Design a protein around this ligand. Sequence first.
Ligand SMILES: Nc1nc2c(ncn2[C@@H]2O[C@H](COP(=O)(O)OP(=O)(O)OP(=O)(O)O)[C@@H](O)[C@H]2O)c(=O)[nH]1
Ligand SMILES: Nc1nc2c(ncn2[C@@H]2O[C@H](COP(=O)(O)OP(=O)(O)OP(=O)(O)O)[C@@H](O)[C@H]2O)c(=O)[nH]1
Ligand SMILES: Nc1nc2c(ncn2[C@@H]2O[C@H](COP(=O)(O)OP(=O)(O)O)[C@@H](O)[C@H]2O)c(=O)[nH]1
Ligand SMILES: Nc1nc2c(ncn2[C@@H]2O[C@H](COP(=O)(O)OP(=O)(O)O)[C@@H](O)[C@H]2O)c(=O)[nH]1
Ligand SMILES: [Mg+2]
Ligand SMILES: [Mg+2]
Lengths: 426, 426, 134, 437, 436, 47
Amino acid sequence: MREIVHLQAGQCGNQIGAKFWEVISDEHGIDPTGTYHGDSDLQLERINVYYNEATGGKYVPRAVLVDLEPGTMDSVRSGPFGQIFRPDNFVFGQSGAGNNWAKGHYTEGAELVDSVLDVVRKEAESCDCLQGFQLTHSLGGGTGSGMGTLLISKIREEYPDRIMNTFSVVPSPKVSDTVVEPYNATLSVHQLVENTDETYCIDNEALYDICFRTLKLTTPTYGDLNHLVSATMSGVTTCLRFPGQLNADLRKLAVNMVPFPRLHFFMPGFAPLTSRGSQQYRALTVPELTQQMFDAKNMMAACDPRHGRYLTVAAVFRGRMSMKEVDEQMLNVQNKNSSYFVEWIPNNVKTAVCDIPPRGLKMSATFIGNSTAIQELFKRISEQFTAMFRRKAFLHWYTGEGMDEMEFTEAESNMNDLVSEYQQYQ
Amino acid sequence: MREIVHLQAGQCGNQIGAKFWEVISDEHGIDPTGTYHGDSDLQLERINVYYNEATGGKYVPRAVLVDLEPGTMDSVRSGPFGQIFRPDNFVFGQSGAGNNWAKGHYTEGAELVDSVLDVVRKEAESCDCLQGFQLTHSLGGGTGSGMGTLLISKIREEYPDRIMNTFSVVPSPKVSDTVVEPYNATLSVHQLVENTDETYCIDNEALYDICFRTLKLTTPTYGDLNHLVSATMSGVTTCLRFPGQLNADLRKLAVNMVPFPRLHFFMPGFAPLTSRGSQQYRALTVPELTQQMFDAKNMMAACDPRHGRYLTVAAVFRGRMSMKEVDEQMLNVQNKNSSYFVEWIPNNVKTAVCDIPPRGLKMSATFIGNSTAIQELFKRISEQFTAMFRRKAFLHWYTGEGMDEMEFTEAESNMNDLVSEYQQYQ
Amino acid sequence: LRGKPRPLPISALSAFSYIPPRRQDPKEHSYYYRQGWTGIISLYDCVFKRDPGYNQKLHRDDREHAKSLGLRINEEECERPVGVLSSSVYGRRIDQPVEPLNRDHGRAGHVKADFYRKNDITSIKAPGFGHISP
Amino acid sequence: MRECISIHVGQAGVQIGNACWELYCLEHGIQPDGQMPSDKTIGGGDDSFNTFFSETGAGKHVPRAVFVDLEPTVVDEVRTGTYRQLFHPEQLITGKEDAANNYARGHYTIGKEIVDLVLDRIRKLADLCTGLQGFLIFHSFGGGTGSGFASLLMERLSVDYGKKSKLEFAIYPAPQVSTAVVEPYNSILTTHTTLEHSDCAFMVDNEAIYDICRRNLDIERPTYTNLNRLIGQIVSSITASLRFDGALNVDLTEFQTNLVPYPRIHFPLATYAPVISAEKAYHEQLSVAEITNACFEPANQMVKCDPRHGKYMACCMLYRGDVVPKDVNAAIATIKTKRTIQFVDWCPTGFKVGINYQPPTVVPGGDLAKVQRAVCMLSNTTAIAEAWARLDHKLDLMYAKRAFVHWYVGEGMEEGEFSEAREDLAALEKDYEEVGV
Amino acid sequence: MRECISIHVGQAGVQIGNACWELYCLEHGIQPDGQMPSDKTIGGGDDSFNTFFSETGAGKHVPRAVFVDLEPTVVDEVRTGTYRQLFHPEQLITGKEDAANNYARGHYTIGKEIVDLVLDRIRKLADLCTGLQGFLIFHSFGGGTGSGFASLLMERLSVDYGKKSKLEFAIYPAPQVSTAVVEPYNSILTTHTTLEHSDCAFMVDNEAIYDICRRNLDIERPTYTNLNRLIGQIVSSITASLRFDGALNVDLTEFQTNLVPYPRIHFPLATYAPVISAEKAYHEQLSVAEITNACFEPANQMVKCDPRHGKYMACCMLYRGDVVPKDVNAAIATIKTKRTIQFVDWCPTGFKVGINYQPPTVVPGGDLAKVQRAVCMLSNTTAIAEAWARLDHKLDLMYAKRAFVHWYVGEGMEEGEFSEAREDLAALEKDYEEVG
Amino acid sequence: EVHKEFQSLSVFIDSIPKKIRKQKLEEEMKQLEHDIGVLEKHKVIYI
Ligand SMILES: Nc1nc2c(ncn2[C@@H]2O[C@H](COP(=O)(O)OP(=O)(O)OP(=O)(O)O)[C@@H](O)[C@H]2O)c(=O)[nH]1
Ligand SMILES: Nc1nc2c(ncn2[C@@H]2O[C@H](COP(=O)(O)OP(=O)(O)OP(=O)(O)O)[C@@H](O)[C@H]2O)c(=O)[nH]1
Ligand SMILES: Nc1nc2c(ncn2[C@@H]2O[C@H](COP(=O)(O)OP(=O)(O)O)[C@@H](O)[C@H]2O)c(=O)[nH]1
Ligand SMILES: Nc1nc2c(ncn2[C@@H]2O[C@H](COP(=O)(O)OP(=O)(O)O)[C@@H](O)[C@H]2O)c(=O)[nH]1
Ligand SMILES: [Mg+2]
Ligand SMILES: [Mg+2]
């Protein structure tokens, strides 16, 4: 009833979406061939939130999978549910970004977005009402941080009233697979602030800590990190497509959350994550779910919430419970953690209750949170940028394509004011 | 009872007409040997529009096919459906033209024109009420544009009230088959504007573009191009042969289409074109058919309409349907891109609906539209004429058969007068 | 061996994520208490056989379940014990009454049903046929 | 006795007649074969089928109409349709090389050779009519053969049959949507011949019936079948008084003598109130106030207009089924107490009520449910003139550029016919702007 | 003929109205599809159902209510629920968008376009009815579509229907437990609208009935079903005397003439005393003398407000069931001797009693036991000045640095209404303080 | 089966053997489609 168009960029976005359309696929219960094979009719009413249809019960996802290489779309087709995606939205390039922001935004990707815009505009005008524009990309890559940022900057000149959420995969602070990553990081950060509505930061090493301490896996493959993140992906927008006692779409998840235009950076969480050795030794109710959110050990950002103060918090509940204890323990976590919330806002947590759980899970919930610890995630990139630009290193890869030097100074200058306005709320 | 006589000049138009009569034979359901085998009754009710009756129930076509060399009639005789054509409906010349207007117009085509006029008058008084004549030929050929245009000239004196529509084959923009193509094409374009009431521009470059990008065919041959043209040729004569809620014959598709005398240059398209690997992912409902027409890449003339501006637009639909959805979506496509339509005429779209779709489909459409963008189809040929005639290069091939010098200048003057007349309505 | 997508190295398969074409145990497997739809036996019927009909109550043809036209949700939780939604409790146990309702204290209207007749003017008319008096 | 001859000219007329005559066969006991069976009679002189059905001594009732078109497509379709044995073969008129959205065919030697045959048809059809009451016209402005040939038919009809009642159920161009590009002038120069040669003019607007079907019946696929069923319903309810008993019977004479004050003001509106699906029929009770209050809503109009901005002039209530007159009177008294409904000064009464005892009949597999109360308002107002203002503006936008004129004047006519085609419409617009003030 | 019109705005209104209309169809013999197994011919004529139902000619009587919401996610499951054959499809107004916790969205962008439909159906319902008494508006202060759309509705029914009865069954946000950060925004600016387009406004607050369920009803972890049923019981006891017979009958006209002393002091309360399960009341009698004592204690009110710091001004007692008026007379004879419940000096009587002869029908599965006597007090007190002081204090706390204004200014608003909606609350505070 | 083979092919084609493989899948599709159509044309089949 509320159309969501799934935008993509790069190998990060393609790999994440390959299991987004696993979790959503089995939540509504489709076959790998696109036919509905669920059990009840609750999953059949709201298929159009994420899916277009056809005749014969054939459902295709409404996604725009795009990168600059044809070597990754064939990897997407080789997955378990790769045969539901369409070839029309298989937009590909010929050359690679190669982990630089210049050739993803002005030279190569500037031509390729002239057709991605055509595919999106064909898809956006093929419905009743778009809710907005979700996208998954990497700020540390070349074709995600470059072409996805350009796609974000190009879309909002046509639909100025929609709500976009960037489920960005921020660079890790410890392990850096690319040396020139803090160039693309700032050169995307300068662009997401003035355009995007709410930004979701996902960090890889925090996900590894989740899979180690909260799950007790031995060898965590990427199919666990991407599945966890896809679980919270489905859990953010669960109230749109399933009924409940108190629903929350993406529009009211931001008017309840953002206080200011320049301050919109969020960081999510997921509650019912437990190991396989200690799952029968705990009763699952509202108390253990409310306890598990508000510790730093279940957070998917690389910042300690103890060092900052939450301005505001959202919370979405799925399944069938009684919500009196829900309000009791939100009030309880306000009562104990008074030092971890600002004192110039009366109420800080949104409570939203759905009525349907995932497949294989029965009482699940999803954390979405604005914090004053994200600037810790930003000053490290800032200090690396100041320490490495000062020797003027790696400039030939960022000047020879027609770029300038003043854009780097603007990227440096935009960070400090944002850090200062975040730090003024401490 | 409103019958139509088909004229065929050259081997280009004969190659198009072989597949045209192939598609008409298939959709009216008559044998390779000329016996009706269609299951329904609606395919027999108005069968005389294309097939005169004969002895033994044989439905002999009423087609006039003339060529200046006897080479290419062996192919159309030894085709699949080549055994239904009447044996004496072929008139051949001993010596062919070979890319010159003079041998088709004054030397050999002038002596041979009495026989084609003879068979045209013989097959034109065997019908009840003639609607008009149809001619397919090549502008860049020698005996298409040389002799079949003389047929236009003679029939315009013989029947000054009937409707003339030409499915002309304009030279391609980038690669040209013949170096003397502009001479033979302008020397017929200059005369065509006086003796014709409709003109359709087909180029093989945009047809290759369609057969590559749209249908995703492996090796596009000229048979596929002929089939793509023949779909448009069979589309325009739908309601003459089939019933429907809103008919449109050839005559209503001309008064509704061109306001002035010398602006009858149309530029067509075809709706249900989907890839073989993308058949199951989309349905050919109302918006998916009405969107493909107003896209640039589905069009059979190699001019982008966004450079120009439409004057009037047609749409001839088939299959069981209603008019709320189509007359909402044509107004949506007429009100969104209002900058793509002139404002001095309020309505621009003509809508016809028949009830019988072609076999294998259930909903079809046929684009017919004049535009200011057809001017650029003639700008390149006029500049080619001016670039080559000023060097007096290829004059001796024409003057040796008794031409005149300033007749080339008069053709250029009429060409540029059409230029000055088309550009005012931008 | 027709074509296999070189399935996977064992370093990629992990211990959390595996979702098959779920067949479900008989009856007792889901939160929804049902078996699961059998589905279309062959996609050729879905792909090469589409009956052309604009089925009279749905805005487009690609929205076959617009106003829940065909979804039988209300019947479906009349076969399972617990309503899956927190709106099926509203009017569930009304086929079994707790107390028969009284029908003595009401608001019966007598001045608008006994004072007014329909139409005869019978005051100026003789009695007629079948006029037994007390 | 009270025979009515109906004229359908143009393929729009054939398509409307193909549903209206189905309703006329269902409202009596007339099968598609054309013989009333023994179990649906009264047992003597019925005299209710005699209005539209003649009587041949072999028990066959033939329709009292003509289906005239210049292309044999729709006429051949009704010739191969289910009602082929109903109409006689001479009652259907075909032609070759149709008018093709052009008025220039209207006054040409091909348009002058076929009006004699249809006039012969009318002459021999009306000669069987002892009590012929008038002619009902079905044609379309936007087409060629609906606007051009029917103009000549009405001209020669007014010449021959003299001062007679002629009412048209004509299709007007819609305000946003259109079909043909040459529809403006084909409607403008056929409006010129319906001012001196007509008595009333019922206009319809295809997108109005579209939006009505959407807002009231929850219906996709409004084809011409679903529109022509409602057009059949209104033409049945206007002639309902001539056929069945009621309290007050409205002849066509007492409709014109009550509804058109001047010879130049004959332009009613139209509304059919109880349009409601079968599903919604059980929930909404159809009482007389709650059915007559929907006709004054501008969202229920049959011609896209706003009567709030204009002023009403006269009305004609055509009630049907079981009707109690005192609820009609009470609602009419209530109707007079809305300030939104403004009335002109020289019509203090401004109402006319007809009551008929026959309930509406429902076609099988159709649109409406079994409804027993009906309202048909034919409300003349000055607010119908805004369509003429848009048409005059939309013709002035095309002229002074000589667009589509060469086919008009090259075919036998004169270019001077356009010059007075705006002068008389300016006169008509100033007439409608002078009456309401 | 004593008809009333109920307006449910927002999904708070829809979920309250589901239970209230459940109690309506169960308090008569009305089947869930809307049919009468015992019509007016059998067992004498009846008209008690005419106050909430419109009997059609075929017996399928339809309710007289409108349910309006912008998001259709809460009306779609009742479009295909257990009550899906009762309501007319056009009494279910659904939009496309969502107001999304914003006063600006539901009042200045999406409010302006669907109002012409709900007014059309309300006018059709008013023409349907011959003897309407007033309006019964169900909406919530803290929402976006229950605060913007509701206030925009009242500002236009005031100019349409003129002097009628407007009785608010409004949900008040709590002092301690809240759901939205933006809750003090839509709960203040809509008070700048309601103060002239309203006549009476009962506040009902959620943790009040949570405490009632956890203390008196002895239900641990209740749900939203165990709240809207009590609200429906309150609402049906309010309109009880309008549709049954007793010693003293109360119409909706005398609520505003007995509980509203001034145009700006029109904010009363609600209390339901005999809320007790079938264990606790199983072997203890419930007389009239102590179901009137339990109501005056703060552990049974439906808003957190301490009347010991307040001054009662006007209360009305809609009693219900097998009660004879001499025990009522003794009941108010007992409580006027209590100093802890103190009245204002100027009001001598300050009391109003109506009696009905109907015991409260019990919904199956509802934990309210079968009781014989039911008292519905609507106290009007000046203690609600305590409730608004903290709301203005937190509004002053968060507006001090102009929080959330940038998304509240682009959607058809400006800073002027934000500035002037605080002076109105200060005037309300001083108006409630000069009387007490 | 042969459609599932088709959907697994490369998104863009540049090499010769992929073209030949795609053509062979195409003609096998046409053979299967033709047999299915000739068997679904009528209700009674002579053998
Ligand atoms: N409501 C309604 N409108 C129709 C119907 N048929 C045609 N129209 C309208 O009438 C207009 C005229 O179209 P046609 O009837 O096809 O044209 P024509 O009157 O037959 O004249 P020719 O084209 O020369 O044959 C069209 O624009 C349609 O919108 C119908 O059955 N019902
Ligand atoms: N007691 C009770 N409270 C409810 C009910 N439904 C919602 N509420 C409360 O009302 C408060 C405000 O919610 P709403 O007014 O419904 O917000 P809204 O109407 O959705 O506004 P939008 O989000 O813009 O559409 C919530 O915090 C809920 O706690 C209900 O059925 N019963
Ligand atoms: N969580 C997660 N991270 C990924 C995945 N694939 C790549 N990454 C991270 O993305 C970072 C660089 O992305 P990159 O390869 O440059 O993306 P590209 O621009 O599309 O090529 C690496 O540090 C990886 O850790 C994935 O599937 N899941
Ligand atoms: N689309 C298409 N074009 C054709 C075909 N055959 C010939 N032509 C065109 O005809 C032109 C050459 O015509 P030509 O042989 O000189 O005609 P001739 O003088 O009669 O022999 C070329 O430019 C082709 O584009 C055909 O089968 N299909
Ligand atoms: Mg015609
Ligand atoms: Mg809501």
